Each structure stands twice: as structure tokens, then as C-alpha cells.
């Protein structure tokens, strides 16, 4: 049930899905500061500049650190992160992507195979507390990508997930996380300490926490996604996307009053 209802949250046509949240179908936010971007900015623009943004952050704009042979996407969306990243790391020949949406992973099949990168991704059916079960435990990951998953996750599936994930990052390793999180510990009619709390008593060193994007930035993402939905769905969008069109506001208004912020949580495995 609990899969299901994460199915259930993913499903819909990935044609339709493109016209609310971009064509790239990054589902994670995105930032507007990046001088790069030429405005008007796309959440397209938007979302991959905030990902450039998190690996800058993680170091891997230095050339002078390992090479990266192996990369992990836990809960990999529509594909698009392990597409940028095997570009990004053309001689990178293994990229595992996991997630439990049968219909997203679908997609991401179709969509790597259709850029000649099926024999360089590699997609599975995975539960990220099932992680000990991905091949190859003689591979360590160099790059673990957690972009806006982990609020998915209930507390004890993010502890044992994280003690699962440890042991098969390399030390030096680099973990590459945007979530969701509360600045508020009360009932108003996971907070950062908690977060970053799982990371360390695992064994992690915390190397870059801040709220990114900004507050501002998530709210112009959301508010720019319930455009979208109201243009191309004028009669009415239905399941997550209507729920999106509705959580835009009241998250948007959240973000304004500063109770929640999107964090970049970049942690490492020591090299000991
Ligand atoms: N327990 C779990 N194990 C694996 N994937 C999970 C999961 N719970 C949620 N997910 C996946 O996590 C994703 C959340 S949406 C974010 C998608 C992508 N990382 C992006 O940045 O666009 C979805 O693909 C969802 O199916």
C-alpha cells in the first residue's frame, strides 16, 4: 500500500505531466539567480541550473578529485537527472537509477533508449531501504543523488535507507540531497537537526547545508507550475497535478512565512 500510493501520486500521462512542470519533468523546485538563465526563466531552466548549483556545492566543478565511476539517483522521477548526469560524466558506464513507480520508470526506459543511453543507466524497481539488493556491492557509488524524495519517506524508512546507502558510497563519496523540511516544531491550525541528525549518526560528514533555493525561488517554481496547469488544463487537471495547482498556494504562502524552506544537504563518507 504504501508503493501504491506513491504509483498512485506518479501516474498520468508523462505528455500531460510536461505541460504543468516542464519538459525535462524535474520535480524538485528550481533557482532564478543563476546568471546563465535569460529571463523569462522555464522550470526547466530553473530546476537543472538548482542541480548545477547542488554538484558546484559537492565539489565536482574541481578537477582535481576522483573520477566518477559510479552514480546512484534514489527515487530517479522521469529520468532526466541520470540523462544531464551521463552527459555530464560522458565516460561514467554505470548509472543506477531506483524507484517504485512503475509508469515513471517506464518512461525513463523509453526516454535513456532514445538518447543511446540504455547500456549506460541502468533502471530498477527498488525501494530505497531495499538498496543492499542493486548489484554489484564490488562497485562503492561515487555520486548518490536524493532530489526531493526523502519527504516521502517516514522517519524509519529514511534511517534504515541511509544505513543501507553508507556502506556502498566510496570514502570521499559524495551524497547530493534536496528536501522538503519544517522550520516549525509545533501543530499550526523532519526539521533540519533531525535531518542532518540521521546523515551523522550514520557516519556521513555534513560538508554543505543551507536552504536552497530560496523561499522566494520554491514559491515562484510553484506558483509558475499552477500557471501551467490553469493554461493547459483550462477544464480541469485531476489527481497530483490539481492537488499541485491547490498545495502551490498554501506552500507558496508557507514559504513566504518562512515555516518550511528547501534545503541542498550535501554529506560525504570520510575517507578513513
Ligand atoms: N521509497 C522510495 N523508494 C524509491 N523511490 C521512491 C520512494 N518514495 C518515493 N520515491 C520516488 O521519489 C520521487 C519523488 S519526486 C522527485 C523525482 C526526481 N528526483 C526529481 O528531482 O525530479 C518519485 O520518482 C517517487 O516515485
Given at each position: 500500500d504504501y508503493e501504491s500510493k506513491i504509483e498512485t501520486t506518479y501516474q498520468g500521462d508523462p505528455e500531460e505531466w510536461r505541460k504543468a512542470?516542464?519538459?525535462?519533468?524535474?520535480?524538485?523546485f528550481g533557482v532564478?539567480?543563476?546568471?546563465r538563465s535569460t529571463p523569462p526563466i522555464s522550470l526547466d531552466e530553473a530546476g537543472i541550473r538548482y542541480f548545477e548549483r547542488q554538484l558546484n556545492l559537492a565539489g565536482?566543478?574541481?578537477?582535481?578529485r576522483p573520477e566518477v565511476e559510479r552514480i546512484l539517483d534514489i527515487g530517479?522521477?522521469?529520468g532526466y537527472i541520470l540523462k544531464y548526469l551521463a552527459e555530464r560524466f560522458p565516460n561514467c558506464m554505470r548509472l543506477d537509477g531506483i524507484n517504485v513507480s512503475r509508469e515513471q520508470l517506464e518512461y525513463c526506459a523509453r526516454f535513456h533508449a532514445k538518447h543511446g543511453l540504455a547500456d549506460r543507466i541502468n533502471l530498477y524497481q527498488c525501494?530505497?531501504?531495499?538498496?543492499?539488493?542493486?548489484?554489484?556491492?564490488?562497485a562503492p557509488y561515487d555520486l548518490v543523488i536524493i532530489r526531493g524524495?526523502?519527504?516521502?519517506?517516514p522517519n524509519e524508512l529514511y534511517e534504515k535507507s541511509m544505513q543501507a546507502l553508507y556502506g556502498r558510497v566510496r570514502p570521499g563519496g559524495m551524497v547530493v540531497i534536496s528536501d522538503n523540511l519544517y522550520n516549525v516544531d509545533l501543530d499550526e491550525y523532519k526539521t533540519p537537526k533531525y535531518f542532518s541528525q540521521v546523515l551523522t549518526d550514520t557516519g556521513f560528514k555534513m560538508y554543505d547545508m543551507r536552504v536552497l533555493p530560496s523561499n522566494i525561488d520554491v514559491a515562484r517554481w510553484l506558483m509558475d507550475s499552477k500557471a501551467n496547469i490553469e493554461k493547459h488544463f483550462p477544464h480541469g487537471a485531476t489527481g497530483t497535478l490539481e492537488e499541485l495547482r491547490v498545495l502551490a498556494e498554501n506552500w507558496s504562502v508557507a514559504l513566504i512565512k518562512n515555516k518550511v524552506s528547501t534545503y541542498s544537504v550535501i554529506v560525504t563518507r570520510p575517507i578513513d
Open positions: 512542470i516542464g519538459d525535462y519533468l524535474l520535480f524538485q532564478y539567480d543563476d546568471p565536482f566543478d574541481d578537477p582535481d530517479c522521477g522521469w525501494n530505497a531501504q531495499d538498496i543492499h539488493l542493486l548489484p554489484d556491492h564490488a524524495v526523502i519527504s516521502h519517506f
